[PDB]
């Protein structure tokens, strides 16, 4: 159903944001060490 | 309605592509320094 | 909503693939600094 899809999408995008933020923070730290 | 959802999704996916591209670009550069 | 769901599945699969490649590459650089 539509409402279920929308909830799934919010969870997916939330997880993607989390993973991207972790990557960005780690990449910042590596860049600072070169 | 559906049109609103599709526009929101399109915007979300565009932002994710932009961020991924920036990360890939930055990773390429760091890999060259280590 | 079959068409949209199929498109979304494809997009999310591609994102997971790209994220995995990034995480692998990031792990290696962290080990090399």
Swiss-Prot record, chains A, B:
Query: In which domain of life is the source organism classified?
Result: Viruses
Q: List where this protein forms a coiled coil.
A: 1-34
Q: What exactly does this protein do?
A: Acts as a viral fusion peptide which is unmasked following S2 cleavage occurring upon virus endocytosis.
Instruction: Give the protein's recorded name.
Output: Spike protein S2'
Name of encoding gene: S
Swiss-Prot record, chain C:
- List where this protein forms a coiled coil: 1-33
Q: Note the superkingdom of the native organism.
A: Viruses
Role, per record? Acts as a viral fusion peptide which is unmasked following S2 cleavage occurring upon virus endocytosis.
Name recorded for this polypeptide: Spike protein S2'
Q: Which organism is it from?
A: Severe acute respiratory syndrome coronavirus (SARS-CoV)
